[PDB]
Amino acid sequence: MEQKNVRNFCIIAHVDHGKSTLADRLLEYTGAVKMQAVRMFYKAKDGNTYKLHLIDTPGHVDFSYEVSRALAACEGALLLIDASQGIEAQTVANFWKAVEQDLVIIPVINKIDLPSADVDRVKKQIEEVLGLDPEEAILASAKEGIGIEEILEAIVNRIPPPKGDPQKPLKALIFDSYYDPYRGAVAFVRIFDGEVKPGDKIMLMSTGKEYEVTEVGAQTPKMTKFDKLSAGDVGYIAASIKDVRDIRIGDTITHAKNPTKEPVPGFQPAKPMVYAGIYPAEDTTYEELRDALEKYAINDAAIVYEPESSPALGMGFRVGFLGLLHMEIVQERLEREYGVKIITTAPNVIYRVKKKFTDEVIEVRNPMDFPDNAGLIEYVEEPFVLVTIITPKEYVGPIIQLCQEKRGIQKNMTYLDPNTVYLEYEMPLSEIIVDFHDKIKSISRGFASYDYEFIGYRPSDLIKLTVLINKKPVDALSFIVHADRAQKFARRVAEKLRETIPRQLFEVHIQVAKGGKVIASERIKPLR
Ligand SMILES: Nc1nc2c(ncn2[C@@H]2O[C@H](COP(=O)(O)OP(=O)(O)OP(=O)(O)O)[C@@H](O)[C@H]2O)c(=O)[nH]1
């Protein structure tokens, strides 16, 4: 009558395979603040109309958890594959994350209008690699509109409808959020059990905090207030919440008065993985910078930052990101929407250091916090990740060689077809966050894709290198490198500066040191 006519799905596509486009198709084909919890109605060939909820999902590995949550809020997913490219890194990673949630995956080959397009290719891959029936695949072109209905049909027919009870205690999964200046901290939620209407007293199961709902509704696609949200629904909720960290993604929203036995599984707070110091550039100032960050941080529950200063650089901030894209985003967004101009140090992972006389192991986020006294270090550990790569046979050698150089241990190798190779390497994260994205693209003509997952901390032989410009060290220029790779980084970084420094009067001497010892030098002569 209502919840048996509901379809909760999301679009799972690798980078640039058509995810955003196809979404427009669906609304257009159905109609007559970021995009999320989009609700639309559809008249199927079978007769009645259905309530469809399109949940938006992050693409980059940086938001893997958040993607896992978005998936948790659905019954099915459309796995979008570009017929010209085929299965790529994310396509496979996302597939499995979707499988881990028992979602009905509906394959969708897009861009079949392309000359370069090759379906029997993708269908072959789908079967051999994904283990899916090539026959379930939906051929389609979003650029046009070929197969759109064919798609809405698949969703309705193949994807089961929600299955919770609206009479049981409220149980709603938070899969997204954002700060609304007028509504406050808002949470995009999927409702499994019960219902929620304005005025109700909800509670956040991880924190124990209670709030009074002020409004509920969904993107239709405009923020549309409703009288309520029932089991099986997807929408938003407002309850005068101070900020987005109070409604953490993956958290559960029940009733304060009568709560549900347990909370939806898999809650994990935000865990910054990569850090970097951000200093005020040009004429931008510490205050303006400190100000923009406080303004940004409202629309970001993942980011953390603390004041750090340098003798050379001055006053700035040590900021933690989920990964490289998140950081990139935060930068683009700051220089843009805030005008502030910032300089950013090289990124670094959090290290776990055990030093003598200190029972507790210290976590290093800022390299300058790393013990200058090597002998006082009992050991050091750094995060490792499992990197998966997809590439044409031709590029395998250079790639493998690239990986080996950066300390990657090949764990597996296979063929997604006679010309495409699949690879699994175990390498330090510290090595992936440094010129690995460009170098693999450079050597693969942009044809090789890759994804990776954190697989824990492993003890390693790392050291601290210091940078001195004319015999004068720069606290914020020091970095932690593997002892064996030290010389090379020493040299690289040396040249980077030989160029990065603007020729002034005297002679700018640059030295990279390994605990006293100098292992790299670069001196760019005087002024003219
Ligand atoms: N020729 C052709 N191009 C398409 C088709 N679908 C999408 N594109 C184009 O592919 C490019 C990227 O499409 P998007 O919809 O942005 O793909 P996306 O997954 O949203 O990209 P990201 O937002 O980075 O994840 C754009 O030029 C789209 O118009 C298609 O069916 N045929």
DSSP-assigned states of every residue in 249-264? TT-EEEESSS--SSPP
Would the CB of 85 count as within 6 Å of ligand 1?
no
Would the CB of 146 count as within 6 Å of ligand 1?
no
Q: Are strands 76-82 and 104-110 parallel, antiparallel or unpaired?
A: parallel
Q: Are 209 and 289 in contact (CB under 8 A)?
A: no
Would the CB of 110 count as within 6 Å of ligand 1?
yes
Q: Which of 135, 164, 193 is the last residue before a domain boundary?
A: 164
CB neighbour list of residue 101: distance below 8 Å, 6 or more residues apart:
68, 71, 72, 74
Domain residues for the domain of 327 are 265-346
Spatial CA neighbour of 364 closest among 275, 301, 427:
275
Q: Which two tokens stand for residue 153?
A: 């049909």
Q: Specify whether 483 is located in the same domain as 416.
A: no
Q: Whose CA is nearest to atom 30 of ligand 1?
A: 111
Would the CB of 16 count as within 6 Å of ligand 1?
yes
Would the CB of 219 count as within 6 Å of ligand 1?
no
Return the ligand 1 atom nearest residue 13 CA.
Answer: 19
Q: Specify whether 188 is located in the same domain as 131.
A: no
Q: Which of 242, 264, 286 is the last residue before a domain boundary?
A: 264
The single residue listed with the structure tokens 């995810």 is 19
The single residue listed with the structure tokens 């979008």 is 80
Domains of the chain: total? 5
Q: What angle do CA 497, 499, 504 make, to 5 degrees?
A: 95
State the Cα–Cα distance between residues 525 and 408, nearest whole angstrom.
39
State the Cα–Cα distance between residues 269 and 187, nearest whole angstrom.
15
State the Cα–Cα distance between residues 199 and 196, nearest whole angstrom.
9
Type of residue at 166:
P
Spatial CA neighbour of 77 closest among 86, 87, 68:
68
Give the experimental resolution in Å: 2.9
Q: Specify whether 283 is located in the same domain as 143.
A: no
State the Cα–Cα distance between residues 72 and 190, nearest whole angstrom.
9
**Cα 82 to averaged position of ligand 1 atoms, centre (Å):** 9
**Cα 110 to averaged position of ligand 1 atoms, centre (Å):** 9
DSSP state of 369: G
Q: Whose CA is nearest to atom 28 of ligand 1?
A: 18
- Residues found in the chain: 528
**Cα 143 to averaged position of ligand 1 atoms, centre (Å):** 8
Type and span of the H or E element at 292: helix 286-296
Would the CB of 13 count as within 6 Å of ligand 1?
yes
**Cα 19 to averaged position of ligand 1 atoms, centre (Å):** 7
Q: Specify whether 17 is located in the same domain as 44.
A: yes
State the Cα–Cα distance between residues 326 and 320, nearest whole angstrom.
10
Instruction: List the CATH number of the domain containing 252.
Output: 2.40.30.10
State the Cα–Cα distance between residues 241 and 309, nearest whole angstrom.
33
Experiment used for this model: X-ray
Q: Which of 400, 434, 460 is the last residue before a domain boundary?
A: 460
